[PDB]
Design a protein around this ligand. Structure first.
Ligand SMILES: Nc1ncnc2c1ncn2[C@@H]1O[C@H](COP(=O)(O)OP(=O)(O)OP(=O)(O)O)[C@@H](O)[C@H]1O
Ligand SMILES: Nc1ncnc2c1ncn2[C@@H]1O[C@H](COP(=O)(O)OP(=O)(O)OP(=O)(O)O)[C@@H](O)[C@H]1O
Ligand SMILES: [Mg+2]
Ligand SMILES: [Mg+2]
Lengths: 256, 246, 256, 246
């Protein structure tokens, strides 16, 4: 109805033959949902979300957004890249300002400028607004990509491990901010996480993919918690500490 | 306090200026040394430039200035054409594959071979000299810009693909800042080639301009023959050095 | 003592109208064979301090002494797992590890060197991708080969900068093992920068806790009084385990 | 199935071949068209090369091969000298700042101006022609290599610094593989300059070789004057195209 993945697959031509990454993945993501895609390293989480963002054409399959095939990346499908693609010649302010000006140039300065300023303060890079990416740390590079994506406020958000290089305090702070902007708008978030505690706190549904070649979706879960999720209370519910080890069970079972 | 950026040029200038003199100790070495070169031409030329003796004997100040306006116009047109074409050729790999050979076969034509062809095309011989400068010092700018665009990292292109960065916005925000070393190196080589083809280009104009001064001094063998052209080359290099640092 | 730090104080120029003090007055002594964690906030100076020990960065005032001789340049006995993984795109996974172990062990008949590369690939589980370039890997996959080439050299001092950030639950837990036994079997002292509290306690002997903001200094050097053989299961059962863990979260919260 | 790699060059070849004919419809355009250029020179030259009718009249195959052996030795020396130097001046910025000016002033010298200097230094005139080719087609190889080394990402340098990679091993494992687009682009431009100064270089040798054929056809005006030099340039371009893809 909103975002349909219809039997997509990915074959990568290698000198040793054909390598299969994806095989028969089906998804039905409704508007405004939060989906966390977890799995092993090298199973195909980034490849699967690349097709939704338009960066990878499926070998056999099609991805539809509102009954429309996806073939080219757009600004309504903003992505947070796993490598934090930032332009080295721009500052933290200019990197975010590039996305703001490109997706809507109609309004003049001092209004789109304020959008950049508030998003830098949201991630906490207020002091780091005049330095190049070569002068900031890896975690600070991550927050520039987050601020760049959140400023556009796209129809659907695609995140590829957006909190990997952040400490516990900073990561938890950004999770709440991500949730706040997720509810105040109609943003659909497709998120990749390697932390089980992170996926359960944010996602409405948790999707796991099998490891190795020809990876398909296995044992999709639902997350039945009250919408205003808060820490120190979601762990208190009996629905926690059994969904979590269920995810750990699948991750450990996929080995060999 | 520039002790490592103004002194090493002078220290390095000490070499190739004294060993040049020692190279003349060999009797077979007919090339004049720095002492001979800077003394034979000292009286009429090094004493004062910008002197007029009628006809076309304008010393060296006007000769290097008259040719400066020729290479300046030729390089400016080639720099604009080379950069724009290189960006257009760098993108759209089908277009790069389309005109691949007719740019390669057209860039091996010597400026002396361009002299008769440009005469027939332009029957004024004033813009013919400009074309020789333009068509010679355009391939380093064109090739370096094309290779620079083709070598843009996918990370910057991915950022451009997500946003609606296409057309002039894509070139001015992604293509140009990324390919700065390639474009500027092509301009650096292009500057040298504008002066490298000034002797041939100014074969269709009067006796004023460096390149006509070099040509007629090479044809007429006198006692102060090699010294005159060597001093002219030094003037060209210094002018090309200021143009390089610009 | 094995590696010691007197008074390192890092100042960055910031040419246009500023003077940033990343670090100041850091005193730290690490004994031989000791595993030290370097937890802290994102952008506080963990990598800058780690680089100074490695030699990639020069302290403005102060110095780092290793076995009685001053550190002033990078050396193979101080191999670093780079946060950006610093992979060479023109070399495969096997060749990237091969480049690491070809200069540390010159004169090895080229027969044992091939075995060293292959068995270190086994440790990180990249056998099915030893012929793939970094351009056709994943973020977690690129991280594993980065640590694979570091462990192949068997450094006297091992410097780790977020070595498990892009790994899932099983691989990170599996790669936490085969790292402490190398530190146990071989006399390897390790300095690790991590953002996961549950793994800092499992690996380290004492936890250095830097202070958020400019002019960062060492807050606490609290040590874990746990037996060296750890299997990640009984260490949690220790009553003191949670006491140290909440102490770590305590200082991280007060730096907000 | 080369439909987008061999076909587009010929489709793009149709343009600049028919508009060239259409440009001659203007009576002021004295340049011969493709039809007359390939017809006036058809009988003696295009029918069969490698015909010897006496000294300095060895058709066109020996002309394109005698010059090929001159540019081949000149470019090979310049390619080696430029790459080895470009790495050495590319690293050690103190050396780069040391000989910055003496290379800029020495690369603006036209090949025709190098002709009298080469004769004085080399009183044999056989290697002096090689020197003109060598000294002309060396700076793009030198300039691109220095820029490439200076633009090596710090990530690759960091890997080389932590390991004991320095000297020959550092050049063959980090400097060369990283600076492949820069070095090869300079070589491609260097190939063009070797043929760009072949007319000037062969001013000191016999009448055999392309460059002597261009020069003496430019001095003497005949009915098949412009057509002969245009056909010779086509042979040079095709040979340069084969050398470019190597
Ligand atoms: N261009 C490519 N050519 C060949 N194989 C590729 C290519 N891109 C990805 N792969 C392979 O696809 C598999 C999964 O890649 P992908 O980047 O989607 O992993 P992931 O599970 O999302 O990553 P992470 O390690 O961050 O969890 C890996 O085996 C990888 O080698
Ligand atoms: N060249 C530089 N110029 C200016 N400031 C710099 C420079 N290098 C680093 N900094 C700043 O100094 C601090 C040191 O950053 P560092 O990489 O050590 O942090 P970190 O704690 O390792 O980061 P993270 O946890 O995000 O990876 C940061 O605040 C950074 O922005
Ligand atoms: Mg990935
Ligand atoms: Mg860091």
């Amino acid at each position: 109805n909103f975002l349909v993945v219809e039997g997509v697959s990915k074959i990568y031509p290698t000198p040793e033959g054909p390598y299969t990454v994806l095989d028969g993945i089906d998804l039905k993501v409704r508007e405004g949902e939060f989906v966390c895609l977890i799995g092993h390293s090298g199973c195909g989480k980034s490849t699967l979300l690349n097709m939704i963002s338009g960066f990878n054409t499926p070998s056999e399959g099609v991805v539809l957004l509102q009954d429309k095939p996806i073939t080219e990346p757009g600004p309504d499908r903003m992505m947070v890249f796993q490598n934090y693609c930032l332009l080295p010649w721009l500052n933290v302010f200019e990197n975010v300002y590039l996305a703001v000006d490109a997706v809507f140039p109609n309004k003049p300065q001092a209004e789109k400028r304020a959008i950049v300023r508030e998003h830098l303060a949201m991630v906490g890079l207020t002091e780091a607004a005049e330095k190049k990416p070569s002068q900031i740390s890896g975690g600070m590079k991550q927050r520039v990509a987050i601020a760049r994506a959140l400023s556009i406020r796209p129809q659907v958000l695609i995140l590829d491990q957006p909190f990997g290089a952040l400490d516990a305090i900073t990561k938890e702070e950004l999770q709440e901010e991500l949730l706040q902007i997720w509810s105040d708008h109609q943003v659909t978030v497709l998120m990749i996480t390697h932390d089980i505690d992170e996926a359960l706190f944010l996602a409405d549904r948790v999707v796991m993919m099998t490891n190795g070649p020809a990876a398909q979706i296995g044992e999709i879960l639902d997350i039945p918690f009250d919408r205003p999720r808060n820490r120190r209370r979601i762990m208190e519910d009996p629905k926690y500490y059994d969904l979590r080890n269920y995810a750990l069970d699948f991750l450990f079972n996929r080995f060999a | 306090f520039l002790w490592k950026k103004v002194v090493p040029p002078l220290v390095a200038l000490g070499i190739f200026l004294v060993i040049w003199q020692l190279l003349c100790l060999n009797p077979n070495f007919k090339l004049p040394g720095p002492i001979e070169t800077f003394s034979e031409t000292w009286d009429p030329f090094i004493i004062n430039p910008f002197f007029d003796n009628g006809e076309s004997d304008k010393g060296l100040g006007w000769q290097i200035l008259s040719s400066l306006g020729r290479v300046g116009l030729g390089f400016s047109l080639a720099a604009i054409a080379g950069i724009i074409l290189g960006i257009l050729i760098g993108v759209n790999p089908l277009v790069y594959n389309a005109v691949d050979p007719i740019f390669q076969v057209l860039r091996t034509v010597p400026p002396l071979a361009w002299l008769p062809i440009s005469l027939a095309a332009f029957q004024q011989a004033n813009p013919s000299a400009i074309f020789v400068i333009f068509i010679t010092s355009i391939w380093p700018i064109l090739l370096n810009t094309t290779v620079g665009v083709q070598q843009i990292p996918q990370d910057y292109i991915n950022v451009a693909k997500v946003l609606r960065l296409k057309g002039v916005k894509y070139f001015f925000k992604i293509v140009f800042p990324a390919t700065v070393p390639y474009i500027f190196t092509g301009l650096r080589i292009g500057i040298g080639l504008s002066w490298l083809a000034i002797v041939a280009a100014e074969m269709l104009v009067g006796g004023v301009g460096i390149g006509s001064f070099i040509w007629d001094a090479y044809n007429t063998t006198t006692e102060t023959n090699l010294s005159e052209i060597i001093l002219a080359l030094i003037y060209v290099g210094l002018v090309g050095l200021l143009l390089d640092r610009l | 003592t094995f590696v010691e730090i007197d008074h390192v104080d890092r100042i960055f120029d910031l040419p246009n109208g500023g003077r940033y003090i990343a670090l100041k007055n850091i005193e730290l002594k690490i004994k031989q064979g000791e595993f030290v964690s370097l937890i802290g906030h994102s952008g506080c100076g963990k990598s800058t301090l780690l680089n100074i020990i490695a030699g990639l960065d020069r302290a403005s005032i102060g110095g780092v002494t290793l076995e009685g001789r001053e550190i002033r340049e990078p050396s193979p006995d101080r191999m670093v797992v780079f946060q950006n993984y610093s992979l060479l795109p023109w070399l495969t996974v096997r060749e990237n590890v091969a480049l690491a172990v070809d200069e540390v062990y010159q004169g090895k008949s080229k027969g044992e060197r091939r075995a060293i590369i292959e068995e270190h690939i086994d440790m990180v589980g990249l056998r099915l991708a030893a012929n793939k370039r970094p351009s056709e890997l994943s973020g977690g996959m690129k991280q594993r080969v980065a640590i694979a080439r570091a462990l192949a050299t068997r450094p006297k001092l091992l410097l780790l900068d977020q070595p498990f950030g892009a790994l899932d639950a099983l691989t990170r837990g599996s790669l936490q093992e085969q790292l402490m036994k190398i530190c146990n079997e071989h006399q390897i002292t390790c300095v690790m920068v991590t953002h996961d509290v549950d793994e800092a306690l499992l690996l380290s002997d004492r936890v250095v806790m830097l202070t958020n903001g400019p002019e960062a200094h060492i807050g606490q050097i609290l040590e874990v009084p746990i037996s060296r053989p750890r299997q990640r299961l009984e260490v949690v059962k220790h009553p003191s385990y949670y006491n140290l863990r909440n102490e770590i979260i305590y200082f991280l919260n007060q730096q907000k």
